[PDB]
Design an enzyme around this catalytic site. Structure first.
Site, PDB file in Angstrom:
ATOM      1  N   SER A 127      32.510   3.457 -19.480  1.00 21.50           N
ATOM      2  CA  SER A 127      32.436   1.905 -19.331  1.00 21.50           C
ATOM      3  C   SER A 127      32.837   1.675 -17.922  1.00 21.50           C
ATOM      4  CB  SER A 127      33.688   1.356 -20.066  1.00 21.50           C
ATOM      5  OG  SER A 127      34.098   2.536 -20.957  1.00 21.50           O
ATOM      6  N   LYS A 153      28.489   1.205 -21.040  1.00 28.45           N
ATOM      7  CA  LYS A 153      29.032   0.116 -21.354  1.00 28.45           C
ATOM      8  C   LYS A 153      29.362  -0.820 -20.179  1.00 28.45           C
ATOM      9  CE  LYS A 153      33.855   0.218 -23.297  1.00 28.45           C
ATOM     10  NZ  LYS A 153      34.695   0.171 -24.708  1.00 28.45           N
ATOM     11  N   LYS A 155      31.486  -4.212 -19.048  1.00 28.41           N
ATOM     12  CA  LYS A 155      32.093  -5.558 -19.187  1.00 28.41           C
ATOM     13  C   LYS A 155      31.335  -6.669 -18.990  1.00 28.41           C
ATOM     14  CE  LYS A 155      36.769  -4.705 -17.712  1.00 28.41           C
ATOM     15  NZ  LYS A 155      37.047  -4.205 -16.185  1.00 28.41           N
ATOM     16  N   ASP A 180      31.015  -4.869 -23.496  1.00 25.35           N
ATOM     17  CA  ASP A 180      32.543  -5.027 -23.816  1.00 25.35           C
ATOM     18  C   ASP A 180      32.744  -6.590 -23.487  1.00 25.35           C
ATOM     19  OD1 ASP A 180      34.903  -5.301 -24.449  1.00 25.35           O
ATOM     20  OD2 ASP A 180      35.903  -3.661 -23.461  1.00 25.35           O
ATOM     21  N   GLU A 205      30.840  -5.476 -28.238  1.00 22.76           N
ATOM     22  CA  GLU A 205      32.243  -4.933 -28.505  1.00 22.76           C
ATOM     23  C   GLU A 205      33.162  -6.228 -28.543  1.00 22.76           C
ATOM     24  OE1 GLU A 205      35.729  -1.452 -27.776  1.00 22.76           O
ATOM     25  OE2 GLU A 205      33.680  -1.804 -26.672  1.00 22.76           O
ATOM     26  N   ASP A 230      37.116  -3.521 -32.425  1.00 23.85           N
ATOM     27  CA  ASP A 230      38.030  -2.765 -31.609  1.00 23.85           C
ATOM     28  C   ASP A 230      39.401  -2.959 -32.101  1.00 23.85           C
ATOM     29  OD1 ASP A 230      39.873  -1.510 -29.961  1.00 23.85           O
ATOM     30  OD2 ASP A 230      38.829  -2.357 -28.065  1.00 23.85           O
ATOM     31  N   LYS A 254      40.143   4.107 -32.148  1.00 26.82           N
ATOM     32  CA  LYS A 254      41.030   4.578 -31.418  1.00 26.82           C
ATOM     33  C   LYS A 254      41.932   5.183 -31.995  1.00 26.82           C
ATOM     34  CE  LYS A 254      40.685   1.711 -27.079  1.00 26.82           C
ATOM     35  NZ  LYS A 254      40.491   0.340 -26.601  1.00 26.82           N
ATOM     36  N   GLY A 282      38.626   5.037 -25.768  1.00 26.70           N
ATOM     37  CA  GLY A 282      39.493   5.617 -24.831  1.00 26.70           C
ATOM     38  C   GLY A 282      40.446   4.604 -24.300  1.00 26.70           C
TER      39      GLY A 282
HETATM   40 MG    MG Z   1      36.407  -2.141 -25.177  1.00 24.43          MG
END
Ligand code: MG
Ligand code: MG
Lengths: 360, 360
Positions: A127, A153, A155, A180, A205, A230, A254, A282
C-alpha cells in the site's frame, strides 16, 4: 494435552521507523515454552476505538487475573475465560493470540497448521500513500511492480482519486490494482467513485464511515467496483451481516481487530460460505505480529494478496531474530512451532520503555 | 460573545451508595464561570466498551490539550476541535457537556432552554429488578404506581418474562408497562417473546445483541410488541439506520452514550422525523449527570417517561447542593443557568480519590 499459564509479561517497546511506533507485547509462559503476541492499538484512537492505555489496564486488571495460574484445554478455552466484557477486541486478541502461540508450541506444531492452513508461502502486495502527482505515483508504483508485488494499493481522497488511478492504470494495464478510500467519502460522492469503474480495480476499501454497513450496501448498488470492508467488520457475525446486506464483496481481515485467530478463522469461513474472499490486512507490525498474520494467511480463502510485506521495508532492525522477507510477491511461512519466530531479547531490551510481570 | 477555556479539572470521587460508585467529573473553567459534567464509563467494560482509565488518559493526553487556551464560539465548535478521533463517545461527552454548561452560564441561560426545550418538569419512570416470584413483583409494582411513577419497567430474562408480565398486567390493566430484556435473548426466543404481545407492553428494550440492529429488525417482524433500542444507537446516523431498518420504534436515549447534548438532540430530531419517541435513559448518575439528563429531557420528543428519578433513591448524600427529587412521577427542572446545579466542594473533598488541574 492441557496447559497451565504460570506467568505473563507485558513489554512495551518503541521501535524507530525509516518517527517511531509503539509495540505492546504480551508474553505468556507455561509448560516450559512461551507464547508471544503484539497489540495493534495505538496511544490515541486514530484507526479505531481502542488505546494502549485502556487495553493494558484491561489486561493487568481483568484478563490476566482471570487466566493466571489456571489450566486450559485449548485457546478457545482461554478466550472463554475472559468473561462477557464488551468490545475491546484488540486487547482480547493479545491474550488469545499468545495463547495460540503457547499452545502450538506445547504440541510442537506450526500455528498455521493448527488453524487448518497448508500453504507454504503467501502472496503479498503493498500500500502506497498519496503522491504529489500522476507521474510520481506511477514512478513509485513501478518500483514496487519491479519488486514483484502481486497487488498495488493506492490511498485516495477527494479529489485525488480518479487521477492517480487512471495514470497507474494506463502505464500498467495488467496489474491487480486497488484503492484505500480511507473513510473519506459519502453517498454524495457515488458519482466520482463510479468513474473508477473503468480501471478494473479489484476493490475500493472502506469508502464511507468506518463503522458502517448500511450505506456501503447502498453505494455498492450504485457502482460496479467491488467494495472491501475493513473497520466495519469486527466479528464473524459482522461479516455475516455485511455480506447478507451486500455491503461488500471482499473483507480485509485483520486478526487482532476481530479478537484473534479463532474468530478470524470464523470470519474467514463465513466469507467463503458467501463466495467472498478475504485478504490479510497489516498495521506496521513488528515481526511478532507479522508472523501471526502470515500463519493466518495460509488459510484457503485468503485468495487476494495481503499487506504482509517485507519487514526491512519498515524497521532497520526488527524485534525477532528471523527475517520476514518476501520475494516476487511471496512471503514464505517462517518455520518452527507456533509463529516460527523468536524474540531478540537483547535488542528488545534496548528499545523497551515499560515492562511488568504478573503471576497467580 | 465567545468563550475561552482557561483550565480544566478532573476529579474522581467514590460516592457511597444507599456499595460505592466511582464518579469521574470534568470541570471546565472560563470567563469567570465553570461547566461541569460526569463520565458514565466504568472501571471495566460491562455496559459498553469504554473504561475510566482509557477515558481519562484520552482527556488529559488528547482532548484537554486540544482545547486549553483556545477560544470558541459555541459547544459545537468545541466538539469539532476534538475532531478526528474514533469512537470514545462517552469521553468526548465529558468535554462537550461540560462545554454546554459553561456556554450556557456565560449567557445566563438554563441548558434545556438553549437546546430548545420548554418543559418545567419531566415525567419519570421506575425500574424494577428481577424479583423472587409473581406476587412479589406485583407488590413492588403496586408500591411504585402508588408513588405516582408514570411507567413501570420490569427486568426480564429467559425463564422469567411472561410470568411477571402476565401477573403485573392482570393486577394493572392500564398502566404503561415495559420490559428490559437486557440483551439476553436470541432469535430462537421469538416465540416466547411473542407471548408478551397480548399484554400490550409499550416496548421491549434491546432483547438481542447490544451492538445489533439487523437481527432486531428481524425480531420486530416476528412479534408485535415494539422494540426499543439502547446500546446499538450511539449517533444520529445509527438512529436513522435503526428506524429505517425497522429495528425498533422507540429509542432509549442516553446522552453520554451518543457523545453529548448536540448529538442527542440530533438523535431526538431524527427519531421525531420518523414519529418515533425517545426517552431519557439513566446510569446511576450523581446530581451532575442527573441534572444534565433532566435538562435534555425537556425536549418535546421525550414523550415517554425517563430514568431521572429521585437522587435520594441512590445516594445517602449527593455531590450537589440542590436536591433532585421527583414528586408524583414529575421531576422539576432545576432553576438557574446551565444545569442549574452546583457542586458542593467541601462534601466532594471528603469523597475524592483523585484530582488534577490542567492549564495552557
Ligand atoms: Mg486500508
Ligand atoms: Mg433500561
Amino acid at each position: 494435552r492441557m496447559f497451565k499459564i504460570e506467568a505473563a509479561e507485558i513489554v512495551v517497546a518503541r521501535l524507530p521507523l525509516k518517527t517511531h511506533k509503539v509495540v505492546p507485547l504480551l508474553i505468556l509462559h507455561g509448560e516450559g515454552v512461551q507464547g508471544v503476541a503484539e497489540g495493534t492499538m495505538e496511544a490515541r484512537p486514530m484507526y479505531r476505538e481502542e488505546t494502549i492505555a485502556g487495553a493494558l489496564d484491561l489486561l493487568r486488571g481483568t484478563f490476566l487475573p482471570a487466566i493466571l495460574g489456571q489450566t486450559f484445554a485449548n485457546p478457545e478455552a482461554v478466550s472463554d475465560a475472559l468473561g462477557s466484557y464488551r468490545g475491546n477486541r484488540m486487547a482480547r486478541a493479545m491474550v488469545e493470540m499468545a495463547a495460540w502461540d503457547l499452545w502450538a508450541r506445547t504440541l510442537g506444531v506450526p500455528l498455521g497448521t493448527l488453524l487448518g492452513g497448508h500453504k507454504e508461502q503467501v502472496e503479498v502486495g503493498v500500500s502506497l500513500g498519496i503522491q504529489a502527482d500522476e507521474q510520481a505515483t506511477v514512478d513509485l508504483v513501478r518500483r514496487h511492480v519491479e519488486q514483484g508485488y502481486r497487488r498495488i494499493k493506492l490511498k485516495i481522497k477527494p479529489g485525488w482519486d480518479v487521477q492517480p488511478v487512471r495514470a497507474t492504470r494506463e502505464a500498467f494495464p495488467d496489474i491487480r490494482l486497488t484503492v484505500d478510500a480511507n473513510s473519506a467519502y459519502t453517498l454524495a460522492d457515488a458519482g466520482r467513485l463510479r468513474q473508477l469503474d473503468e480501471y478494473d480495480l479489484t476493490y475500493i476499501e472502506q469508502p464511507l464511515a468506518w463503522d458502517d454497513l448500511v450505506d456501503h450496501a447502498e453505494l455498492a448498488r450504485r457502482i460496479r467496483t467491488p467494495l472491501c470492508l475493513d473497520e466495519s467488520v469486527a466479528s464473524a457475525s459482522d461479516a455475516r451481516k455485511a455480506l447478507a446486506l451486500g455491503a461488500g464483496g471482499v473483507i480485509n481481515l485483520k486478526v487482532a481487530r476481530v479478537g484473534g485467530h479463532a474468530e478470524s478463522r470464523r470470519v474467514h469461513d463465513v466469507a467463503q460460505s458467501f463466495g467472498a474472499p478475504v485478504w490479510c490486512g497489516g498495521m506496521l507490525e513488528s515481526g511478532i505480529g507479522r508472523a501471526h498474520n502470515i500463519h493466518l494467511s495460509t488459510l484457503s480463502n485468503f485468495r487476494l494478496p495481503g499487506d504482509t510485506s517485507s519487514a526491512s521495508r519498515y524497521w532497520e532492525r526488527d524485534l525477532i531474530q528471523e527475517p520476514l522477507e518476501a520475494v516476487d510477491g511471496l512471503m514464505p511461512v517462517p518455520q518452527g512451532p507456533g509463529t516460527g519466530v523468536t524474540l531478540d531479547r537483547e535488542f528488545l531490551a534496548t528499545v523497551t520503555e515499560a515492562q511488568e510481570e504478573h503471576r497467580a
